[model samples]
Target: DYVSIRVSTLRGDQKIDFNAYVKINDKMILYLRRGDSFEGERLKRLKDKKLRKMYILTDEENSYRTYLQKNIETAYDDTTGKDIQTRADIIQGSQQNNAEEVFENPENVESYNYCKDAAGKYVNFIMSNAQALSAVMNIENTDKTISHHGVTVSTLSIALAQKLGITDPKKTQLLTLGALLHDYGHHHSPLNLNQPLDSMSPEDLALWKKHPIEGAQKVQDKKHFDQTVINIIGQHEETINGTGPKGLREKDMDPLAVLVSSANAMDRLITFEGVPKAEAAKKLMIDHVGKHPLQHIQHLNDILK
Candidate 1:
């Protein structure tokens, strides 16, 4: 099977590092080669042919993934003529790009600071938009990548917080940072981070559960993070009814952490489960049933609607 790269994912004038193919007459035909810039006339051809997703060979998947990220960085660096949602997509794409470095060198203050600045871009972007919720949630999530999840949870957490009454840019930025970094050690661990959990070994599963604590420790007392941000990262897996990893109830948990956790669940349901955003709140209300706050659930209904 070929790796399907979205047309939108290939935006900008970046040099193609992967060869791309198109389906015609049931044959996978090579259409774009490496060294080609996917701009100018290529854009016209894609529009005229109504191509949505072009394919790259499975062997070239890694190059395709890295190339997509390169476009993300270049796209956001100059939003210039892009629309608000497209701009958010680029900013969120930037979130994932920065997040990889943030998780890998958890002790690196500069990387953490750099990510905080990226979070500032997100906070500033959403705070200025009236329909921020849609702009944040409406972007197409490709392949459920780790960066996609971080960016999704971060932006969604910020958007939900604003509608839930945390309007200050300072607070939203804090939530963004925590949510983006919430699963740090999970990504950094030696384990194959993408393996389906049910098939995971018991020892591996045991090690998997320590991510929250490690994440908190990695940046605790660090210059760039507030204690609340650290707690938000540590308590992101805590539930309202004391059923989560920490067995902590809402009464003992950070409200912002609960918000981030809810956003995390929302991202899973909508992105991984293929549930519609409008119905995700209702699904969470049913499937999670007291796992999240009553008001949080109610507000999601209003916000997502």
Candidate 2:
């Protein structure tokens, strides 16, 4: 059988040597893989070139899966379950061994690099196993400061979703993914890199203030983050009085957003200045919740007390 080729625009038959182009094809073009960047003279060179024949070729890449295994390995090693550093390091494409340095400051880590490893897992886990939500909810590895806070926020999100009667497993999973990555900004914000975020300089404070938006920005469309989840993470800081960063009003602050904020505050109080679990939980509520907005907070005071 012979193959036929025709010019659709000209409505005319055409035939060319497919074999002739085949031998030289390898030398004529280069395959641009994902993550490849070209700039300056290199960019100009690609822009000017017109090939004798052009065809794009693609092959499945396995680096993504390899990176996932690396992420899981790091997660297993950082057992305190609160250590977001390794994940943050993974995101910024930093040397895993140097996670400590990357986790201590904002300028050093870019947005994609902020939580690459963790964001990947959050997306992958939800896609693979919805039960991961339950696993995250019951997570007790809250020893590392950041990890503890992140786990607490994620756990509280589950609690809040359950209370809201969020029965849709997929939606719940998405919310959990957002909740888990909510602090991604801390990697590139004052907190993750600062070690002790409270001691941030004025410049650092400016950067820290953008964390809610930064977190939202980190995983917005990277894989599994849906709209509801992004909105929740972005708006988490909005106060009922519209005093929050995004200028969100009471009603504008959706349930998940309010839930994340409330959960974050609880974690802050529970670990005030690194107080041990025994003394921090109650004191934190009275001290910190009194300062920030914990929606419908009065209802929980008696119980939390």
Candidate 3:
């Protein structure tokens, strides 16, 4: 007998037939075949996906935060140590952004130190209490919420790096650094309730797109950071179609940058405009989170298989 079951699948358009698979009634230890659109069970399926994304992102964020706290003193604490000369060059390059400005000035290590310290603390707090953090970020401006986003991306990048078998801690640090501060240029948003993310003026959009470049520029000027990290931040948004703000292709972007892009998309998916955390998460997976246009999950599944 062909039993029809309507499942909420994330794709273009409304709730539809879920990816046809076995539907399990866990409490009863019973499994049923799912064929088409199901009504009664669809809501639960949607909720499940959303919950999964949220849980995964939070787990990734927490683990990455722990890694960061352990390695805060140096870019990579292993035997080789960091390449001091290379980092100095990065700082030298960033001086062009605004040498005279205190915030942008490469010489203003005091200011930069404070910013990094504050960011570290923020990431730690978010990791420690993700539910509370999600409660706030789910309301608005998830992108503007810096530390959490960075930690999420860093966790994702770490996972991908580990999967690819890249063992060096330096590479891990670079990826995490890029993930941690990708939105460094978003210092202007005051989060006025009156303003909407879509309402950004043309000038604001132009300025906003500069964040990646500005992040790279800032890191370069710092002269005490990794250039690979700067490049990853600068190119994270470069799309596969070369239509991104930087007009770079997927090939031109760093591998870690690509991973961070996926991480960021998932982050946004689990958050909504003025929605509650659980609601946003529920809708995210059911509406779109797990459904990557590029078949990312398929690849992941294959890897695990």
Candidate 4:
């Protein structure tokens, strides 16, 4: 009758006789027990040990179940109908919390991992979940502006990468990671961080122009990545038409950088600037047909098709 619960779900105020059991040689032993309290040195030790799930005694199991069901019912909400959406909600919540942690502790491995895991989830959702493509393309979460843009760009970047025959798993992963962090430059800027560059003032426009370099430099200083990945982050704003922040032409830009830049441009136009996808693609075709590499533009056209 013992009820199993994830250690992470437990609150400090939970009143339950939670017990820690371990096996010693040939016998099971009760190593520790806490009654009517969920926090202490033992809990810390368990957390350090990375214990995920534990048990509550059978005698109190019924009451604990009632308490958990009442307070944590939202965790079990059946309204979503899709398990991936449920997981997406959970992962998004974790990333939102970790986003603050990353700001406070830049270069923290744990914070980066949280963001990376979110990227991986996005990739999986895009590649494996047929329904997720439409869901993401028409997502409604505009409140988390940065994360929303990051996810959208990463999804499109992966799709574009795949279309270009860069299907190697490691390279695909780097594309996702680079796309997710490409906007890291916005971390420290003069303008409102939530607004896109198109909406910035002249003074803020200059600051906005520097974000790609700033973001790439920050990644170089704090994170380890290949030169190609760094180039993608730094050169995303560059155009093949010599009209970009860096004024790099098609031959001067890296192929992978062009791919990320194409996806980033498309996403910004559609999501950030409120242009429809068809209109955004059409604009990119007309205004910057030569701004991006030929293959990259063709691949983008294929993706839109």
Where model 1 places Cα greater than 4 Å from the true spot, the runs are 1-81, 130-136, 189-208, 221-224
Q: Which sequence of candidate numbers ranks them by TM-score, best first?
A: 1, 4, 2, 3
lDDT of 3 at 79: 35
Order the candidates by lDDT, highest first — what do you get? 1, 4, 2, 3
TM match of model 2 to true structure: 0.46
TM-score of 1: 0.70
TM-score, prediction 4: 0.64
Residue pairs with backbone overlap in model 2:
82-147, 82-148, 91-113, 91-116, 92-113, 103-193, 104-193, 105-193
| Candidate 2 residue lDDT tens string, 1-305 | 22111110010011111211111533533333344332223323432433212332222213433433454455434343433432322222221212222234323535324343444444443334434444433322223334335545655555555555665665565565456556656653334442334576778666767877876676565443357666876877666666667777757766667766666655554443454444544554464444334433532332233
* Residues 1-305 of candidate 1: C-alpha lDDT, one tens digit per residue: 88776554554466788889999988899988888764444544544565655888999998988877666665454445555555555455467667777776667879888888778777776666665557656555644555667888887787788778787777788889888887775664676544544467988766766777776777786776667678887888788888777789888888889998888877667776677788889888897898988777777677677
Worst 10 residues of 1 by lDDT: 38-47
Local lDDT at 140 for model 4: 35
Estimate the lDDT of model 2: 0.45
- Off-target runs (Cα >4 Å) in candidate 3 are 1-144, 190-203, 272-305
lDDT of 3 by residue, 126-225 (tens): 3333232222222222332443345544544555555567656556655655666665555445433223335678776676677777756766766755
Q: Give each model's whole-structure lDDT.
A: 0.72, 0.45, 0.43, 0.61
Q: Is candidate 2 or candidate 4 better by TM-score?
A: 4
Best candidate according to lDDT:
1
